[PDB]
Every structure is written in C-alpha cells, then in structure tokens.
Scaffold this active site. Structure first.
Site, PDB file in Angstrom:
ATOM      1  N   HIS A   2      61.752  14.960  44.827  1.00  0.00           N
ATOM      2  CA  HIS A   2      60.992  14.556  43.630  1.00  0.00           C
ATOM      3  C   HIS A   2      61.969  14.088  42.542  1.00  0.00           C
ATOM      4  CE1 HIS A   2      57.212  16.234  45.047  1.00  0.00           C
ATOM      5  NE2 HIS A   2      57.827  17.365  45.363  1.00  0.00           N
ATOM      6  N   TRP A   5      60.103  15.097  39.083  1.00  0.00           N
ATOM      7  CA  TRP A   5      59.793  16.489  38.817  1.00  0.00           C
ATOM      8  C   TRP A   5      60.966  17.435  38.923  1.00  0.00           C
ATOM      9  CZ3 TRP A   5      56.348  17.980  35.690  1.00  0.00           C
ATOM     10  CH2 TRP A   5      55.143  17.231  35.523  1.00  0.00           C
ATOM     11  N   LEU A 159      45.487  11.281  33.189  1.00  0.00           N
ATOM     12  CA  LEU A 159      46.593  10.398  33.567  1.00  0.00           C
ATOM     13  C   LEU A 159      46.095   9.308  34.544  1.00  0.00           C
ATOM     14  CD1 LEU A 159      49.635   9.624  33.982  1.00  0.00           C
ATOM     15  CD2 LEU A 159      49.730  11.434  35.690  1.00  0.00           C
ATOM     16  N   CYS A 160      46.366   8.053  34.245  1.00  0.00           N
ATOM     17  CA  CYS A 160      45.908   6.958  35.091  1.00  0.00           C
ATOM     18  C   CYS A 160      46.809   5.765  34.966  1.00  0.00           C
ATOM     19  CB  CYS A 160      44.477   6.617  34.634  1.00  0.00           C
ATOM     20  SG  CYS A 160      43.734   5.306  35.642  1.00  0.00           S
ATOM     21  N   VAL A 161      47.247   5.218  36.106  1.00  0.00           N
ATOM     22  CA  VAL A 161      47.976   3.957  36.113  1.00  0.00           C
ATOM     23  C   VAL A 161      47.110   2.958  36.867  1.00  0.00           C
ATOM     24  CG1 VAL A 161      50.007   2.825  37.220  1.00  0.00           C
ATOM     25  CG2 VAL A 161      50.261   4.974  35.892  1.00  0.00           C
ATOM     26  N   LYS A 168      55.316   2.112  40.768  1.00  0.00           N
ATOM     27  CA  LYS A 168      56.395   1.536  39.964  1.00  0.00           C
ATOM     28  C   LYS A 168      57.114   2.521  39.015  1.00  0.00           C
ATOM     29  CE  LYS A 168      54.000  -2.862  40.366  1.00  0.00           C
ATOM     30  NZ  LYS A 168      54.734  -3.458  41.516  1.00  0.00           N
ATOM     31  N   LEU A 170      55.829   4.317  36.747  1.00  0.00           N
ATOM     32  CA  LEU A 170      55.253   4.224  35.417  1.00  0.00           C
ATOM     33  C   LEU A 170      54.702   5.613  34.961  1.00  0.00           C
ATOM     34  CD1 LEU A 170      54.637   2.557  32.856  1.00  0.00           C
ATOM     35  CD2 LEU A 170      52.621   1.599  33.986  1.00  0.00           C
ATOM     36  N   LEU A 411      38.296  19.652  32.531  1.00  0.00           N
ATOM     37  CA  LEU A 411      37.300  18.574  32.607  1.00  0.00           C
ATOM     38  C   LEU A 411      37.679  17.495  33.657  1.00  0.00           C
ATOM     39  CD1 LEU A 411      36.433  18.327  28.769  1.00  0.00           C
ATOM     40  CD2 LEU A 411      35.200  19.666  30.507  1.00  0.00           C
TER      41      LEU A 411
END
Ligand SMILES: CCCCCCCCCCCCCC(=O)SCCNC(=O)CCNC(=O)[C@H](O)C(C)(C)COP(=O)(O)OP(=O)(O)OC[C@H]1O[C@@H](n2cnc3c(N)ncnc32)[C@H](O)[C@@H]1OP(=O)(O)O
Ligand SMILES: O=C(Cc1ccc(F)cc1)Nc1ccc2[nH]cc(C3CCNCC3)c2c1
Ligand SMILES: [Mg+2]
Length: 411
Positions: A2, A5, A159-161, A168, A170, A411
């Site tokens: 990772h 991370w 979180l969304c790409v 990439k 990102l 959520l």
C-alpha cells in the site's frame, strides 16, 4: 503493498491491531501552526473547489458526480443514488465546517472530478470495556482511561473519483487535502467506514436485508427466489406471503417525532448508547438535526406513554439506481438508523419500523449488525447480505471490538 496507506498513521496489520491494548493516538503530537497553510499541490489542469452544500446548484453538482460514479454492488447492477436533500442533511449538521467538504474540478470547464466530505462528530472512543478489564488486571487502569472523554473528531464519507480518473492516485491526494483542512482546525482523528478492506479495521459487521417488496426485489435481481421455495407449486406466491406485514403499526401511541420530543429522545438515546464501546454524543441541536422527520430523507417515530416518550426508532432513505431493468429504475431502500426501547422488546419496536417503511413504498430495509440489531434478525426475517462494512479510525489506536459494541450509524 500500500504505497499510500503505508505512509499514514493507521495500524498496518491485524497482527499490529492484535497487540493494541489502549485507545490513543498513533502520530507525533502536532500543532495547527505546523500544518501547511496552502492546499496540497495538484496538477495545473485541476483546481480545488469548496462547494457550498447549502447552495442548490453546488449540491446538485456533487449529487451528479455521486449518482454516476459512487459505490455500486459487486455485479454493477445497482449504484447508490443519494438525493440532493439527503446530501444537504448529511453534510450540514449543526456547526459543520464548510472547508471540510473538498472537491477537485477540471480547471477548463469546471467538470467535477472528485469529492470527499468530513463532518464533525463527538465520539466516545476510549478503551473498550474488555480491554479496561485487562488493564485493571495489570494495574494499568490510568493509561487505559486516559482518552475516555468524548472527542470532537471528523467523520469522513462520500469519497468519490470520477470513473474516467480511476487508478490515477487521485484518492490519496483528496485524503491528504482533507486531512490538512481538518488538522488546520485542530482536529487530529477521523472515523470512516468502507465496504472494502483497508489497513486496518477496528470492527467489521455483515449487512442485513429485510424484504418488503419481494416481487420487485426478485425482478431486479436484488434477491433470488431461494432453492427451497421450488418444493412449492407457486414459489413466488409463497415468497410474498412470507414477507407480508401489517397494513398499520401495532404499537398504540406510535406517532412521528416532533420538535418537542427532542429532549426526551436525546435522554433515552444517550442512556442507551452508553452501553456500547464506540458511540456518538449528541446535543439537542444534533438530535434535532439527525432525527426530526425530513421528507424523503429521514423518518422517526416515537412511542408515547402517558405524555412521555419511552421508545423511538428512525430510518433514512437511500435509493439506488437499478442499471438496465425495463420495469424498474430505482430500488427504494430504508436503512435502520438510531433507536431506543425502554417499554417494549426491540423486535416489537422494529416490526413497526418495517410496517411503516412498507406502507411508505420502501422495497427493502437494510442495516449492519451494529447496535443490538442482531436481537431482531431472526424474528423479523432479516437475512445476511454480501460482504461486510468495516469501521476505521485515522490516527487512533484501538483494540479490535465486536460490531455489537459499535453504536455509530454511518450514512
Ligand atoms: C484527521 C483527519 C483525517 C481525515 C482523512 C481520514 C481518512 C479517510 C480515508 C477515506 C475514507 C473513505 C470512506 C468512503 O467514502 S468509502 C466509499 C469509497 N467510494 C467508492 O467506493 C466510490 C467508487 N470508487 C471510487 O470512487 C474510487 O475507486 C475510489 C475513490 C474509492 C478510489 O479511487 P481509485 O480507485 O481511482 O484509486 P487511486 O489510484 O486514486 O487510489 C489508490 C489508493 O486508494 C486506496 N483506496 C481505494 N479505495 C479506498 C477507500 N474506499 N477508502 C480509502 N482508501 C481507498 C487504495 O487502497 C490505494 O492506496 P494504497 O493501497 O496504494 O496505499
Ligand atoms: O444497501 C446495501 C446493498 C447495496 C449495495 C450497493 C448498492 F449500490 C446498492 C445497494 N448495503 C448496505 C446495507 C446497510 C448499510 N448500512 C450502512 C451502509 C453503508 C452505505 C454506504 N456508506 C457507508 C455505509 C450500508 C450498505
Ligand atoms: Mg485516481
């Protein structure tokens, strides 16, 4: 393994997690003054954008990014479709920090490429009951109690790409910039969940589903007709009968929650959540925000006995896009939220949740086995789903706990 991370203040393995005995921070103590003033560097064709999540047109731009690019099921049959009203509710609780909502846009046309959001939460996250016992056995009570006080931290979600910008690297840039903006407000921990395994969860639980509209669920392949039903002349008919519910609630004095209930609901909730190792602490303003009914978003009912609130439940709505069915565009799902029972068994209280959700046109009721959700699985006919929701902290060492010791709904 990772590349990102491994650089972050989180436990790196299950082995490491196995060793942790006390709650507390992972990283060097740091100050606001140590943290860079300026946003993290990003490619000159991109730019950072802080949407105003109470401005309709900004909420809409985020709404579309997520509608087309957010979490799907494993077979690309469904993708969550959180509503604009739901995003304003989730992203703007009392004393939220606008700067914690972080987006990347393509500088040219301003196409929204990526998003991550943080909101404030006050969380009990001190050493869990089973570890405090071991601590007492070793004469280490004081170290074990050091971080018992509820902490004001960040809860990260959404979180969304963009699908065209995947793989990439990102996501790590988004996470770094969020961490910077949170640290600039002198907040040093975050709590987040994911259905994927990352380094390293402190708790993990299965998902559970309770069919409300089984003909629709089978049609969209959310559910199958299970093999045992083939012994029947009419498998589908028996499946509908199996999940049928009363047309009206069974508890007398069930009604929708109203503003005046806020203090009694806060009290019964907060007493209840205390029995769990990890859980939120809500002010009256926060109980108001998270539990008062909001059309199409959150639904809350109290049981009122002698002008007193003795029980309540809540659920919220997240519809999912059904990808490629000719009969159905959307799956209308209700998710079990917070509740507290003091006068009736929990199964009897939650049966009313299923009855209400069903009457309101929900197709399925979903939950994870946190809280005491396991206590009503069998009798209320929930079945385990695929995979697991994993709970994580950022910059917080924490002993492994059972999901039934978690009381933070995500959520
Ligand atoms: C004190 C304040 C701290 C605040 C921050 C606290 C931490 C918050 C952390 C965020 C909590 C989020 C809570 C939720 O919202 S969970 C929901 C996440 N969203 C989705 O699943 C929507 C659809 N998928 C996507 O949008 C993208 O695939 C995402 C954005 C998920 C990854 O984009 P992409 O596919 O283009 O990959 P990359 O090349 O850019 O990046 C690769 C790196 O990303 C690591 N990765 C992959 N998935 C996740 C994930 N779900 N959480 C954390 N990390 C993840 C991966 O292990 C790798 O690192 P390393 O393995 O190489 O080391
Ligand atoms: O609702 C589902 C199943 C599903 C999966 C992907 C879809 F695109 C649509 C439906 N699972 C499920 C069931 C109970 C849950 N309780 C909390 C969550 C997560 C929702 C996404 N954010 C993290 C929590 C959660 C998720
Ligand atoms: Mg990427």
């Amino acid at each position: 393994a990772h590349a990102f991370w491994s650089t972050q203040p989180v436990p790196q393995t299950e082995d490491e997690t196995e060793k942790i005995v006390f709650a507390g921070p992972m990283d060097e103590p740091k100050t606001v003054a140590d943290i860079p003033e300026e946003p993290y560097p990003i490619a000159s064709t991109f730019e950072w954008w802080t949407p105003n999540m109470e401005a309709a047109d900004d909420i809409h731009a985020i709404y579309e990014l997520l509608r087309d690019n957010y979490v799907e099921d494993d077979d690309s049959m469904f993708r969550f479709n959180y509503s604009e009203e739901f995003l304003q509710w989730a992203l703007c609780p009392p004393n939220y920090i606008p700067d914690w909502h972080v987006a990347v846009r393509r500088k040219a046309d301003k196409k929204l490429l990526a998003f991550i959001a943080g909101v404030p939460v006050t969380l009990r996250m001190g050493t869990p009951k089973y570890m405090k016992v071991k601590a007492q056995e070793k004469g280490e009570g004081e170290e074990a109690a050091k971080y018992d006080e509820p902490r004001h931290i960040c809860e990260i979600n959404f979180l969304c790409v963009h699908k065209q910008l995947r793989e990439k690297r990102l996501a790590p840039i988004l996470i770094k910039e969020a961490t910077r903006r949170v640290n600039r407000t002198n907040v040093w921990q975050a709590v987040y969940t994911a259905g994927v395994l990352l380094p390293t969860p402190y708790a993990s639980g299965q998902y559970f589903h309770r069919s409300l509209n089984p003909e629709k669920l089978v049609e969209i392949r959310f559910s199958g007709i299970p093999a045992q039903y083939q012994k029947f002349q009419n498998p589908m008919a028996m499946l509908k009968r199996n999940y049928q519910l009363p047309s009206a609630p069974k508890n007398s004095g069930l009604r929708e929650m109203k503003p005046s209930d806020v203090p009694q609901v806060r009290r019964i909730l907060m007493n209840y959540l205390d029995s769990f190792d990890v859980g939120p602490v809500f002010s009256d303003a926060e109980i108001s925000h998270y539990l008062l009914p909001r059309d199409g978003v959150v639904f809350t009912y109290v049981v009122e006995n002698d002008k007193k609130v003795t029980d309540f439940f809540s659920f919220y709505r997240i519809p999912s896009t059904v990808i490629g069915n000719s009969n159905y565009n959307l799956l209308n799902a209700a998710y079990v939220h917070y509740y507290a029972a003091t006068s009736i068994p929990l199964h009897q209280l939650i049966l009313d949740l299923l009855i209400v959700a069903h009457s309101r046109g929900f197709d399925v009721c979903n939950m994870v086995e946190i809280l005491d959700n396991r206590s009503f699985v069998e009798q209320l006919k929930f079945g385990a789903g695929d995979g697991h929701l994993r709970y994580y902290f950022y910059n917080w060492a924490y002993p492994k706990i059972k999901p039934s010791q978690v009381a933070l709904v995500m959520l």
